Amino acid sequence: VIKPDMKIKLRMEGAVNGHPFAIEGVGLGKPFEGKQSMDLKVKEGGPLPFAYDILTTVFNRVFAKYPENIVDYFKQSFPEGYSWERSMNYEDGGICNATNDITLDGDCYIYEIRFDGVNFPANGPVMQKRTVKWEPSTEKLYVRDGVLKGDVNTALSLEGGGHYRCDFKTTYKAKKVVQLPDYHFVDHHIEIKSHDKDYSNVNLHEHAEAHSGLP
Amino acid sequence: VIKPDMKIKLRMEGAVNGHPFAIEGVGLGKPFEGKQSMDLKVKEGGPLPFAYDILTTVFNRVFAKYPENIVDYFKQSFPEGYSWERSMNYEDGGICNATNDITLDGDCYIYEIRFDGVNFPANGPVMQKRTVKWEPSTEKLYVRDGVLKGDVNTALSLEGGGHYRCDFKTTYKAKKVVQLPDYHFVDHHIEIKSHDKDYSNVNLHEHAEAHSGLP
Amino acid sequence: VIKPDMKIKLRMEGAVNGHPFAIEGVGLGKPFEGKQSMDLKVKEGGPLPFAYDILTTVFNRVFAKYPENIVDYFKQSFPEGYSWERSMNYEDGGICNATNDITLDGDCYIYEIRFDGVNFPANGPVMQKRTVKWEPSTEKLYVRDGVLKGDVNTALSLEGGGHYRCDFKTTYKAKKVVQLPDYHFVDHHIEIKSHDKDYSNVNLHEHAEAHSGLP
Amino acid sequence: VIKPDMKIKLRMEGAVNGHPFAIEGVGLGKPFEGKQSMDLKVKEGGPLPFAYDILTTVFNRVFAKYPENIVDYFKQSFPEGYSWERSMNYEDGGICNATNDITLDGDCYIYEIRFDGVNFPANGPVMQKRTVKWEPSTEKLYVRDGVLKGDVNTALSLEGGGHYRCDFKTTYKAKKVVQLPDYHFVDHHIEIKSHDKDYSNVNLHEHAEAHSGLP
C-alpha cells in the first residue's frame, strides 16, 4: 500500500489576518527514505502579503524514515489514510491553525488543507517577510487519549540575524485502528529550494527521519 | 451614522477539528446601552458535534456602553467599519482562530465571520458538550502599534461543576483613522437565552459596558 | 477576629536573575474597605537593579471589600490564616515565582515571602527600569479541585508609553477548612505613592473590592 | 582548565509550594564525553513531598560532547565559569524557577543552586509522585541579544503510561566574554539510576551530545 516512489496532490484554502488565499501543489517523495519534493502555485489571493515560510510546514509524516524498532503510525494508516490538526504558536502572538485530511488514490497522496493565521502584527517578520528559513528541527511524538500527538518547538532564522520562535502542537488521527508507537522523535529539515520573486511559484523540500534519542 | 436601534446580519463559515459548518444570524441591539440580541441558524454541518459556547463570543464591541470619558474606538470607525482577529486558547490545548469583517449597510451591521478550532480532544468538555455558559468577564483593552488590542481571560462553567478556562487575544483594526483610547476595560456578559435540542436555532444575548477600573 | 484597623509586618527574601536581595515592610489597612498602605525598606541587595514594580503585587487578599452575597474566603481563614503561591508570567519570558505565608499576631498580619524571578532580558523594561506603574486590574477567583484560584491578566505602563503584559496565577490555601466561594472577581489598583531615588524606601498602597461582574 | 575527568560539588536551596528544602551533592564526569554522575543527599525539608524528578535537570552543559564544527560556549567560558537561569513550565501550570552559579576550583565544578516551584496541584503527578523518568530530549541553543539561550520541551513518563509535558527556557551567561555558537542542538538523557525509598539518597546520571540536526 506504500510504494518506494509516491506522488502528492494538494490544495490549500486559507486566510492570514483576514486575507483569503489558495495554493495548489503537485509533488513526489519516497516515504521509506523520509524525503519529498513539491512545486506550489498560488491560485487565489496573490501576491501573498505574508512570509511564505509560515505555510511550508503545512505543505505528511508518511515522508519520514522510520527505523524497524519504532512503530510507524503513518504508514500503518494507509490505504485509508489519516488526518491531522495543528496549532502553530509564534512567540509574538501570531497563531496559525491548520488541518490536513490525507487520502490515497493509487500512488498519489491527496491533501485537503485549511490554514488560518491571525494576530500577526504589521511590524512583524511575517507581515514584513523578514524570514529566511526554518531551522532543522526535532519533533516529539507521544500517545495521548488513544491518538498520536506531535510537539515541536522550532524557530525561523531572520533577515538581520536572530531567530523567530514557534511552538507546534499536532494531533494525528488515523482513520482505522493502527498500532500506537512509543515515545519517539522525528528530525525534520524543510527548505524552500527555489521560488519566483513574489512566491507564486515555490519549490519546497523536506527530509525527515525517526529516532529514539541519544543512543 | 449611528442610532440607538441597529440591526445585525452575519454569516459564519468555519470548522472544528477539520469538521466544517456554517451558521447565519439576524439580530438587533442598542449600541449606546451595550445590549444586543440575535437569532442564529445552522445551515451546513448540522447537527454541530461541538459545544456551541465556543462560537457565541465570535457572534462586535460597538455594542458596549462607553462613557464619555473613554474614547470609543468602535463607534468612531463607522460607517466604514472595522475588522477584528482573535485567538482563543483553551487550557486543554484547544485553539480557535476567528476573524470578523464588520461593515455598515444603513442601520444594519454586516459580519463576515471565519472560525477555525483545532486540537479539541475527544474526551474534552467541548467535544463532549459539557459546557454550560460563559462566565461574566472583564476585557482589558490597550493600544499597540497604532491598533487597539483586546485581552480577556475567562472560563466556561462545566456540567458537573468547575470551570474550563480560555484566553482571548483580539486585535481591533479600524478601517479609517480614528482616535486611540487609553488603557480601559469592558465588562461582558454573554448568554444563550434559548436553543433547541441540537442547537440548530440559538437566541443569543450580550451585555457590555466600558469602564476605567477601580476609581 | 479581624478588626477594622489592622497592621502589617513582612519580610521578603528573594532573587531576580540569580542576584539575591531582601526587603522588610510595615503597614496598615482596613480589611472591610479593601484598602492598605505600607512602607518598605531594602535590607539586602540594594540598590535594586530591577524594576521595583515587579515586587509590589507580592507585598493579602484579606484587604478586599467583600459584598454580603460573595463568600469571603480570606477573612474567614483567620485567626488561623492562609498561604498563597503565584506565578507571574511576563510576555517577554520573564517569570517571577512568589509565596506568602500569612499569620496573625493579635492585630498584625505577618508575611513570610519568597520571590524568585528569572530570564529577565538585559534590554527589557524590567532590567532597564522603564516601568511606570501597574494598571488597574480585575482578578477572577474560582475553585478548582477544592482550592481557591486567582487569575488576573494585567500590564505595566512603560515610560515612553506602552504596556508590558503579565499573567498572574495564584493559588490560595487556607490553613483550616473554610467555605469556598462561587466564581467572582476582585478589582485591584496598586500604586507606589512615594519612593526615593534607588527605591530603598517605598510607600505602597492598594485598593481592592470584590464583585460579581455585569451588572 | 578542562581535564578528561572533573569532579562536581553542589548545594541546592529551594522550596516547592512554599515548603523549603536543601540538597547537596558530589559527583564526577567527563566533559568531552557529555556524561556525568553524582550522588545527592537531602539535608533539609526531608522527606520530600514532591516528585524528585522535577529537580534532576537542575542538578551543567559543560558535560556535553561538542563536535569541532560547533562552538563550545560552556567549555570556552572556563576557568571564569558561567551562570544559568531557567523556567520549567509544566503543562498543568506547575512552574519551577531555578538558577545555578557555576565556578571552578582546580578540577571541581561548584554549583550554587536556587530552586522554586509553585502551583503544583495536590492531585497532580508531582505532588502524588506518579512520575517515572524524564524522556530523552533534544535541546535547541540559539543566540538572542548577545546571550546564549536554550529551549527544550520534554515530558516525564508517568506511572501506568502517559506523559507530563514541560517547557524549559534557559538563559546561559558566561561571566567572561566568549564566542557565541550558531543555532545547534544538544541531545539529553537523564536517569535516576538508584535511590532509597524517600529519595534521601539519589545517584543521578546524564548523557549529552551536541549536533546540528538533519543536514
Coordinates of C-alpha atoms in Angstrom, one line a residue, chain A residues 28 36 50 59 74 90 101-104 110 124 126 129 155 160 171 180 196 215:
Chain A
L28 CA 6.6 13.4 -5.1
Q36 CA 9.9 14.6 -0.5
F50 CA 2.9 37.4 4.4
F59 CA 2.6 21.6 2.9
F74 CA 1.5 6.9 9.5
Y90 CA 4.6 32.2 17.2
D101 CA -7.0 15.4 5.5
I102 CA -4.7 12.9 3.7
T103 CA -6.2 10.2 1.4
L104 CA -4.6 7.8 -1.1
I110 CA -4.2 13.7 -1.7
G124 CA 6.3 41.6 12.4
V126 CA 5.8 37.5 9.0
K129 CA 8.6 39.0 5.1
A155 CA 12.2 28.8 15.0
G160 CA 19.2 40.7 10.1
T171 CA -2.8 15.8 16.7
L180 CA 0.4 3.1 18.6
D196 CA 10.0 33.3 -8.0
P215 CA 21.9 6.1 21.8

